[PDB]
Amino acid sequence: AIRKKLVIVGDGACGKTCLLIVFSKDQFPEVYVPTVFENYVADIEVDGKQVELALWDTAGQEDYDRLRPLSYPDTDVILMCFSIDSPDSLENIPEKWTPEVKHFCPNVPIILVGNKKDLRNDEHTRRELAKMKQEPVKPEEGRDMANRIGAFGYMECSAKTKDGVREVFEMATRAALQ
Amino acid sequence: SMEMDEKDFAADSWSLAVDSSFLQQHKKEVMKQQDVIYELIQTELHHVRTLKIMTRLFRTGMLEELHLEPGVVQGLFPCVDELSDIHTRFLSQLLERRRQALCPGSTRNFVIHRLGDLLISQFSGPSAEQMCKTYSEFCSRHSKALKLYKELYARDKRFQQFIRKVTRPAVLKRHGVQECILLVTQRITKYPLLISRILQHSHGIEEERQDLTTALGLVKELLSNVDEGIYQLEKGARLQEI
Ligand SMILES: c1cc([C@@H]2CCCNC2)c2cc[nH]c2c1
């Protein structure tokens, strides 16, 4: 087994902590959802290759520009997260998170991940967004942003239902191996 | 960690740690507040445990088995004794507050009604000054500690055999040298997330809501000061580069 490091980046409410918790526990916690994620070393087997994938979150570091880059050393794959119920979190990707990740992690593959995909079919979500002349992020808007920033690929998931979660981490492991 | 504290914090939540007959007697709003307070203590217990692996397992093991020059061991684990002192003391107060709150005849049923006062004490005065000075020093030495580690593992056979031996148990899977250093750096930015969520479920008593609001402002002031006092040191950096 080879050791690879994964770091998840994105705005405060992009759902990155929930994504890491759901994958590491291998289910959506029923009794209590933790506020924070410390670290985790996942045992993954993708395309016949065994990898130890260390998982890290940057939640809480969004306002601290000198503390945050300390999470970046020796990263092998970056998951760049946005929330599908938050079109404003998508516009922060190209001129805030992308220049930072390319400066501290040159040549590291970035996977753009659209979280909370279940909220695309939520009535309360659609009503609250329509009040600000907005709508949930469309699949083509996510793909176009991933293409524009030079992402390795574009993927969607739902930590709430676990749909697409396992696929995101298996693809991140494949990206870290290249 | 010690068995007593591990069992007290083994459950995934406060609602699973307490007896179900004690859980039934409480309002859901109290259960929610207690679940987040329990997460704060449980993660503080794990943070102190991370610091003990760095001082007792790694640092002291290197000094006693490898007879490595102490200036090298210092470069690998900057401020570990000072950090261990600050967090072991904070943990002792959190654990004592829980112990005092236990029902007679019980080692697990408790409700912590007051926390803000302890959080204001930890994040103000001399103790806050010591955390600010220590984390500014630690985080400025973080990158150099990682490069020194990578040099020694790649070029020294006895150091590589030492690391492989002490990190072999499954309980150390996420606690290698680099993992411990980043776990420590990330600890300080977890405090506002935990305290804000405790505050969200602490409006029942106005003085407690006020104390948690003050504690939150103090942790953010501390974080902003630590962030401003950081400049990454480079091993063998020239004056012209600084
Ligand atoms: C975030 C971003 C940066 C640079 C400057 C702007 C472009 N992206 C990389 C730095 C430099 C030091 N700390 C930083 C935090």
Swiss-Prot record, chain A:
Per the record, the domain of life is Eukaryota
Q: How is its activity regulated?
A: Regulated by guanine nucleotide exchange factors (GEFs) which promote the exchange of bound GDP for free GTP, GTPase activating proteins (GAPs) which increase the GTP hydrolysis activity and GDP dissociation inhibitors which inhibit the dissociation of the nucleotide from the GTPase. Activated by GEFs such as ARHGEF2, ARHGEF3, ARHGEF28 and BCR. Inhibited by GAPs such as ARHGAP30. Inhibited by GDP dissociation inhibitors such as ARHGDIA.
**Gene Ontology terms for molecular function:** G protein activity; GTP binding; GTPase activity; myosin binding; protein kinase binding
Q: Which residues are glycosylated?
A: 32, 35
> Which residues constitute the signal peptide according to the record?
none
Residues carrying 5-glutamyl serotonin: 61
- Which keywords, in A-to-Z order, does the entry hold? ADP-ribosylation, Cell cycle, Cell division, Cell membrane, Cell projection, Cytoplasm, Cytoskeleton, Disease variant, Ectodermal dysplasia, Glycoprotein, GTP-binding, Host-virus interaction, Hydrolase, Isopeptide bond, Lipoprotein, Magnesium, Membrane, Methylation, Nucleotide-binding, Nucleus, Phosphoprotein, Prenylation, Proto-oncogene, Ubl conjugation
Q: Which GO terms describe its biological process?
A: actin cytoskeleton organization; alpha-beta T cell lineage commitment; androgen receptor signaling pathway; angiotensin-mediated vasoconstriction involved in regulation of systemic arterial blood pressure; aortic valve formation; apical junction assembly; apolipoprotein A-I-mediated signaling pathway; beta selection
Q: Which cofactor does it need?
A: Mg(2+)
Q: Which GO terms describe its cellular component?
A: apical junction complex; cell cortex; cell junction; cell periphery; cleavage furrow; cytoplasmic side of plasma membrane; cytoskeleton; cytosol
- Annotated phenotype, changing residue 32 to F: Abolishes AMPylation by Haemophilus IbpA
Q: Which residues carry this modification: (Microbial infection) O-AMP-tyrosine?
A: 32
Instruction: Give the first-level EC class, as a single word.
Output: hydrolase
Catalytic activity from the UniProt record: GTP + H2O = GDP + phosphate + H(+)
Cite the Pfam families for this sequence: Ras
**Could you tell me which residues carry (Microbial infection) ADP-ribosylasparagine?**
39
**Phenotypic consequence of residue 69 to S:** In EDFAOB; somatic mosaic variant; decreased Rho protein signal transduction; decreased substrate adhesion-dependent cell spreading; decreased stress fibers assembly; decreased cytoplasmic microtubule organization
Where is it located? Cell membrane; Cytoplasm, Cytoskeleton; Cleavage furrow; Cytoplasm, Cell cortex
Q: Which residues carry this modification: (Microbial infection) O-AMP-threonine?
A: 35
Q: Does the record bear Lipoprotein in its keywords?
A: yes
Q: Which PROSITE patterns match?
A: RHO
Post-translational note = (Microbial infection) Substrate for botulinum ADP-ribosyltransferase. (Microbial infection) Cleaved by yopT protease when the cell is infected by some Yersinia pathogens. This removes the lipid attachment, and leads to its displacement from plasma membrane and to subsequent cytoskeleton cleavage.
Know anything about its domains from the record? (Microbial infection) The basic-rich region is essential for yopT recognition and cleavage.
Q: Which disease is it linked to?
A: Ectodermal dysplasia with facial dysmorphism and acral, ocular, and brain anomalies: A neuroectodermal syndrome characterized by linear hypopigmentation, alopecia, apparently asymptomatic leukoencephalopathy, and facial, ocular, dental and acral anomalies. Patients show no intellectual or neurologic impairment.
Q: What is this protein called?
A: Transforming protein RhoA
Curated annotation (Swiss-Prot), chain B:
Where N6-acetyllysine occurs, residue numbers?
150
Task: Check the UniProt entry and state the signal peptide residues, or none.
Answer: none
Please state, per the UniProt record, what induces or represses the expression of this protein: Up-regulated by bacterial peptidoglycans stimulation, such as muramyl dipeptide and in biopsies from inflamed mucosal areas of Crohn's disease patients.
**What keywords does the record list, in alphabetical order?**
Acetylation, Cell cycle, Cell division, Cell junction, Cell membrane, Cell projection, Coiled coil, Cytoplasm, Cytoplasmic vesicle, Cytoskeleton, Developmental protein, Differentiation, Golgi apparatus, Guanine-nucleotide releasing factor, Immunity, Innate immunity, Intellectual disability, Membrane, Metal-binding, Microtubule, Mitosis, Neurogenesis, Phosphoprotein, Tight junction, Zinc, Zinc-finger
Gene Ontology BP annotations: actin filament organization; asymmetric neuroblast division; cell morphogenesis; cellular hyperosmotic response; cellular response to muramyl dipeptide; cellular response to tumor necrosis factor; innate immune response; intracellular protein transport
Q: Where, subcellularly, is it found?
A: Cytoplasm, Cytoskeleton; Cytoplasm; Cell junction, Tight junction; Golgi apparatus
Q: Name one GO molecular function term.
A: guanyl-nucleotide exchange factor activity
PTM annotation, UniProt: Phosphorylated by AURKA and CDK1 during mitosis, which negatively regulates its activity. Phosphorylation by MAPK1 or MAPK3 increases nucleotide exchange activity. Phosphorylation by PAK4 releases GEF-H1 from the microtubules. Phosphorylated on serine, threonine and tyrosine residues in a RIPK2-dependent manner.
Whether 4Fe-4S counts among this entry's keywords is no
Q: Name one GO cellular component term.
A: cytoplasmic vesicle
DH domain location, by residue? 32-229
Q: What is known of its domains?
A: The DH (DBL-homology) domain interacts with and promotes loading of GTP on RhoA. Promotes tyrosine phosphorylation of RIPK2.
The linked condition is: Neurodevelopmental disorder with midbrain and hindbrain malformations: An autosomal recessive neurodevelopmental disorder characterized by intellectual disability, speech delay, mild microcephaly, midbrain-hindbrain malformations, and variable dysmorphic features.
* Stated role: Activates Rho-GTPases by promoting the exchange of GDP for GTP. May be involved in epithelial barrier permeability, cell motility and polarization, dendritic spine morphology, antigen presentation, leukemic cell differentiation, cell cycle regulation, innate immune response, and cancer. Binds Rac-GTPases, but does not seem to promote nucleotide exchange activity toward Rac-GTPases, which was uniquely reported in PubMed:9857026. May stimulate instead the cortical activity of Rac. Inactive toward CDC42, TC10, or Ras-GTPases.
Record-given protein name? Rho guanine nucleotide exchange factor 2
Q: Which organism is it from?
A: Homo sapiens (Human)
